[PDB]
Symmetry: C2
Subunit: 192 residues, 2 copies
């Protein structure tokens, strides 16, 4: 069965940008529950033995929602880090400048997309199959994995991701997200 991968840092490592309490609920309750529900829903089914990505690309309904959310959250935790944030360098910086005009342009576009992604969902930096970077949003458990675009960076805009720390101020959460971005992970994703 699928297991909840260990958080890449201590539960308080993202403070004050994302609190230890947010981590305890978001990781320990929400993410854990998606793992448990996924395992239960796939027992005895043709989805047993399949990778998480394989399930995401071949499922609908509850199986999809849980599988995609498991993957999305693991991806999200890796997108964040202590002692990180700031501006990317190298190939990531160059690709962002080429695709959006500048890092500042990208940051504003990503922020705007995330803030205006209505309801629950995720906002993504992806590499489209044309080789160009783009910002796309998804609803609920939706993920670029069901397309031919490669996810590079994401922000969870489900209210549970930020409500403890920012209440209604999703834009405040976005401001603090930038202080946490793990560009090393983004660079790995782009290089792949």
């Amino acid at each position: 069965s699928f297991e909840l991968p260990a958080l890449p840092y201590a539960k308080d490592a993202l403070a004050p940008h994302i609190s230890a309490e947010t981590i305890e609920y978001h990781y320990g309750k929400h993410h854990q529950t998606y793992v448990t529900n996924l395992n239960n829903l796939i027992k005895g089914t043709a989805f047993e033995g399949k990778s998480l990505e394989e399930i995401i690309r071949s499922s609908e309904g509850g199986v999809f929602n849980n599988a995609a959310e498991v993957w999305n959250h693991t991806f999200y935790w890796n997108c964040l880090a202590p002692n990180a944030g700031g501006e990317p360098t190298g190939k990531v910086a160059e690709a962002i400048a080429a695709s959006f005009g500048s890092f500042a342009d990208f940051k504003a576009q990503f922020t705007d997309a995330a803030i205006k992604n209505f309801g629950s969902g995720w906002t993504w930096l992806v590499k489209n199959s044309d080789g160009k970077l783009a910002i796309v949003s998804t609803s609920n458990a939706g993920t670029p994995l069901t397309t031919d675009a490669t996810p590079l960076l994401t922000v969870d805009v489900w209210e549970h991701a930020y409500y403890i720390d920012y209440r209604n101020a999703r834009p405040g959460y976005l401001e603090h997200f930038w202080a946490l971005v793990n560009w090393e992970f983004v660079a790995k994703n782009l290089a792949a």
Copy 2:
């Protein structure tokens, strides 16, 4: 321009079932923001002169999302009250018993639907135009007003409705919702 209608009670009236803090944010920030955003989108447009309902039934995208949420929240506050809850009497009791067998069955079914509603949204008791009652769930700003059916009761299951008080425990929030239901309002809705 649209005004945020006054809350039917002070912000502590629903406590401890829904906290004063929740109401301060939910009414004073979320509901207010929907009003502000709606006004900004419709100013100087052909949506001026239209009632809230007329906008909801003739719009899409941002105009729709904001107009529907303004209406949904006003309806929600009217569905809740101090010194209420328990079970309906008279016409409402009769109608629910006729359509669901018993109030207890209705209560279980409504609760189940509300807990299963994935992501942000609303769960409703409606009266169809042939008089049948039904439980329906909607996503995000979705509302029975865009259908033929008449809303009788709703619960908001956006995480902002409960996260301060219940965190991830949406079922706890639902339990406490029942302690607040304003059956007088439900009766008005049914009698219209």
